[model samples]
Target chain A: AEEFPVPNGFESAYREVDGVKLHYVKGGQGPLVMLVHGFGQTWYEWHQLMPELAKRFTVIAPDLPGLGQSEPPKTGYSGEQVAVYLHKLARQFSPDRPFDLVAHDIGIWNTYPMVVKNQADIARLVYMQAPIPDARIYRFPAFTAQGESLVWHFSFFAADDRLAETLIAGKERFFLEHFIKSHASNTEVFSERLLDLYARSYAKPHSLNASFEYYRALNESVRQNAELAKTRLQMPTMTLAGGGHGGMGTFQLEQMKAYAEDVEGHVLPGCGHWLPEECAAPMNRLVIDFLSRGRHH
Target chain B: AEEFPVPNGFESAYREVDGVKLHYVKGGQGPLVMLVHGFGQTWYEWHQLMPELAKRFTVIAPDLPGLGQSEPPKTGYSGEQVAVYLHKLARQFSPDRPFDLVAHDIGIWNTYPMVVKNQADIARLVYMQAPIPDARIYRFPAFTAQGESLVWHFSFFAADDRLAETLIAGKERFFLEHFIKSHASNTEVFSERLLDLYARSYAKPHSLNASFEYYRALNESVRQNAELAKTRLQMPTMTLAGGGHGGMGTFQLEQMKAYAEDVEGHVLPGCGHWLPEECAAPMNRLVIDFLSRGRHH
Candidate 1:
């Protein structure tokens, strides 16, 4: 834990809510800014953008269930289930005031339900990299090279009989290196130290199983989110996607516009899927400004 | 080779065509019949059924390129490429006659183009378990458990950067066991001896790479086969699929009907994806009957 220390003025802490112990990093003061880390990363993903955000408002970055140092959920791993758990955790930190939310990848999937079910409790929302599961995912041509390169892991990780968990066992480092590096526009952003940290987190016993549970429950999550999407999100929601390299480009933005009325979109040029790490400066500026304007509403 | 012995009077041989050496087992006399095995097994998958067919005609079963002791192809791994190679091999044996063909899994994928292009050279055709690459495959819901259970490996094996090869390396036994047994209605068909034989074949260097190459070329294969599908086969065709357990049910039958003129379909009761092994008696009887009837034409 000391190897990758929390930045100066930041304190690391754990909070148990809904039977899962979530590890988060907190700093600064004023209205709370809850930052949710995505797959292949932890709360530390926000390390670069945290100090600047802390200057304007309080910052709370957390690792989702079964990722990083957070404990696995006892029951389900659906987006809604993780959403409910994180919603409770956010309420514990800022019980009276609505907090700002920023999530990436699977973090976006988990937090989407939270913002939809508890709109009044979350002031502004930022979703990055990907979107919640829906029929739209099925539209990709599964057999084409273009389709396979972009989303092959969706089915690979979601395979039955623990096929993926078994294959990935004892080789988490090799798999993570390939996965994290291939998705990044600037591979140098993920140093060996960062890669090793993420690999170690994923290598823990039952960790692969827990991580794949989200994919295994994809059908249920899609159904739940589809129902939730029937009623559009009322909060000011923003979608951020990398416009170049290996990211989803504007796919996330276009998808979000279908389910929300008050939505803004951005396509960060020269960035990759690891928006927090690869495009930290631009992301920080955009998120900070968006949250600040959202404060009055 | 001795452990998986060819039946009495049957001889094992090799033929190099199109820059690849193909290993095959041959026996009996009269007209020719070619049997092509699927992903998990070799010509040995036809061991039990070969005797009956050989009694009436010449029976030759060749392992696909890069599988079951056959040398890897020097160039491409698409269905059309493999089809050309196998078509040449059959012509070498039966120079003046059209030979019957029966193929399963990837074998069906490879042989589809040959039968389509040389309709007159193929006296009769039998396709089992699966179909050639086409947009029809894309219709399956990629995110649902039901869809994943049936065909998740399509994308997993098709992944880029040699991902599947790297993960399955040094774990051939575990992967083959799970894969073969899971898809079989009667798992006992794959004895320890059989499983060990397949694992040893797959564990060979470049073997896994060669096997997954077929999947990696899926989009090209889909495009090639779709164009070929516009011209339906004139030869008599039989489509067999397992009606129960983990097979494709009547899916292969329905698909073959779309691209062939004289087509007959059957749903093998109490069978699985390993149609030849799981229901050898029924498959042999049906195939022999179909071929015998086609002889008159």
Candidate 2:
């Protein structure tokens, strides 16, 4: 497994479009490969993979529209809204070129339907660790509890903004503690500095509510995915899942297969939901292998 | 000098009056001694002297209406309102007796006028580093710089509630840092846990605004004090200034003397604005001596 290294003089670009501030960190100078992060985590979650990804291709990672260092907007945080924002982002990053796209967790959930709807400009797609909504096979008995507890925002999304803000503001440490304690294999793996960064970002005035609104928009993603399942995507696709206990599991691959005719699926052993941080080596190898295969086209 | 030991088996009492859940800690079995804290702090601020006070008197420390572990209220957070709430609190704690009051900073600023106007049930007022208005003397210029950089809430109180909430919610750390740093004799005294406690209190929704409103209500205090100054305080009163460079200094003593004929003043050496913590030995001695002198009656 090759570790990613920071390319020399790599810097991020910031631009304001449609009253939204977009921050895109770019490296290398080749075929563009855009990596998107999931909920609760930011582009920094890709710190381990970017160095390797950038060596082979021009890898660009962004703190998606409402997450990370991006300035949160007053409204527009649904999955569809995020997809549209990403479309604008893709256009801004590569005005004349389409790029390969790789995303994990909620990021993939947001972008998958956009790709199926022909709204995304991408040569290939790789989605990892995201639930692919099939009521059967993947239905674990604890799904509701896990969904409620792990992804508690699903229900909290429906709360009044004030109530939601109050709850999150009070329990932010518990939320951060849960994230690090459950996902980060070793307790020490998540440093205080790292926790402070995440805590501070979420603690921002409207950040928690904006995040809850993302979950509120999850049903919109389900409806869009239902509409997109009716059509076939032209781009080749790969889906990967962690074989670890307490996650979406290999069943996610089956759902991905149902949506795309040409799809390759891989499940890495012993990797949990935190694939990028916990199993970066194997995950990056799988991504690089998948992208290299597409390059031959 | 005898040190006030903190009470054992700390128990918190809860009530849901005034549209906010209030939590108060009470100890001892004698005359009621109520200690009120200032901004960015909780009842826990009295942890050092609480046990000692409890030994001699029934010490009641509360999280106030919108502070610490207490739930936030829908409305009414002026100094007078809080003072009125404290009166109700006194009734709850000891229905048959008045409390010997010890207040610091905004706590004194709020309750002082209550003692003057109501004169209902408070006895032996002790003020430590309280900012009582002195129209004649120049305020510590450091406070002006502090008002701009850290104590900006002093000015922001004039803004409408909505704007004040917005500004405070965004810059809570600025306020927290100011209070913690300004009061501590040295940065080393502010442990990580102490700082987190202060941060956590204001991190709650509307807690910052509730606190900011207290500062906003400074004019109310000024007006009440101006009126109350016509009648001298009958109870034994004492004011102590921390002697360090940033102490409220002798001017506060001079102003306090004008309002109370039976006032005795002392400036503790090698201490800052946080006299209780920085110069606890001398502060404790001064408070004990003053209260003991009056007990001869």
Candidate 3:
């Protein structure tokens, strides 16, 4: 068992949104930058990039609804719902200031609605290795043929609560291992402390069901995005593709451009799906540059 | 709490190998296809694919060395040492028949030495989203820049057993949340049942230390691979990247091709780092195709 290191600036402060307490980490002060982490991960993924971003901006990275230190309410937890919660958090934290948005993976998915619906007054957007709701590229065939079973979490999403609960019980390590190995560069990434931490988080009751709800909401979001495509996003957006090149082809950028007027994309080299943790510096640089350019323009 | 859905043949079996009772899940009967899961995951990642693969190939997916169902011995447990243990399991299961290998993430990293050192007579190789040996393209500059404080797991690896134990206690949930959220495509991947299994796995005495040892051995294997690169792998190889461009890109295939003559690669779309559970079917297809090709050729 490894001992826990002292955190940079651990805080217990949280915001109440929709009956849920959203745990967040705050640092620095300037232009507000609200960082949202992807699924299965918490605000901690921003650990590498947060300090640097904080130095330049008031960085507020929160555990999205039902994740991390955030308390999970029994109902009303969807990406849209969480997006609403984030919108409220953003308003409370930076009411007068327009905050910059940086999101990765599922975080990108959740925050997309807020940006698209004009709910979040984000100055600039940095979307990393996320699924842009392009029907053709991310359709059923692509999902069933390439996405479904290879990424087991889809099974949980595709299946009802009954099936998910049955499969997940007493098998948390099995699931955790899949998540850990996904982007770890070396064995050093899966230290004793890390494994133990994961085991403990998963131990919480109803955490799995709450997680499944997010996936269920993902299905709903895809449908919603399809309907919302009638309106284009007015904000400047940047999409980053990890070097691993799984499905993050430039095609996604083309698809995203259909909804956003000013959109740009980059393909990172020699990285996996875990871009924020694996390619934090480059990602941070890209986000900062994109945000700064937005301000200047 | 969600109940454990033990599949028809999903029985926990143990064997006395290397002076310890090694636990594994076995099903089907044919040419042996030994599946080694990466860190924090167990034989369950193969759950969706195994039943299908088992119909043709005898699937023997074991909890490697110290992870999952496998009991760790008090001493002699490093990556190389675990490699020896895995090789022993492979031989014991099917001594005469050369086995096909499918591994993801840490599983691939841990088992690389088996192929590199000719420890096992494996037929085909499928390395999914695993890192290539210190490839320049695979390196992330952020990790180096952020130092230990940000990505504490890297620092955790430097600690001795005492420190490891101290850090892992009580803070397991924090660690788990950090890990799961860091790599998950969405928050739902960390369901309640999943968290419980993870906590129980680590709660066992010395399990944390065994996991730390995997990282400890990783240092040695990296060194070994650097020296052994001149020796080519005799078997055919296939690699699959997860998520869009954010996965293991062409660079990984190129790296594998340098060591093996018949190496191919593909990327799964709409997936994240957790490919096995997040996208099992496509990954299974990739593995099956590679194995079939190896058998015929």
Best by DockQ: 1
Report the candidate with higher lDDT, 1 versus 2: 1
Task: Provide the lowest-lDDT 10-residue window in model 2 chain B.
Answer: B140-149
Q: TM-score for all predictions? A: 0.92, 0.47, 0.48
| 10 residues in a row with least lDDT, candidate 1 chain A | A140-149
TM-score of chain A of 1: 0.95
Write down the RMSD of all candidates, one decimal each: 2.8, 20.1, 13.9
**Candidate 2 lDDT over residue span B133-206, tens digit each:** 43331222211211111222344343342434553465565556655565555446667666666787776776
Candidate 1, residues B237-261: lDDT per residue as tens digits? 8989998777787788788778888
DockQ, every prediction = 0.43, 0.01, 0.02
Ranking by TM-score: 1, 3, 2
CA lDDT of each prediction against the hidden true structure: 0.83, 0.65, 0.64
lDDT of 2 by residue, A211-230 (tens): 66665556555665666678
User: Over all chains combined, what TM-score does candidate 1 have?
Assistant: 0.92
* Candidate 3 residue B20 C-alpha distance from true site, Å: 29
> Which docking class does model 2 fall in?
incorrect
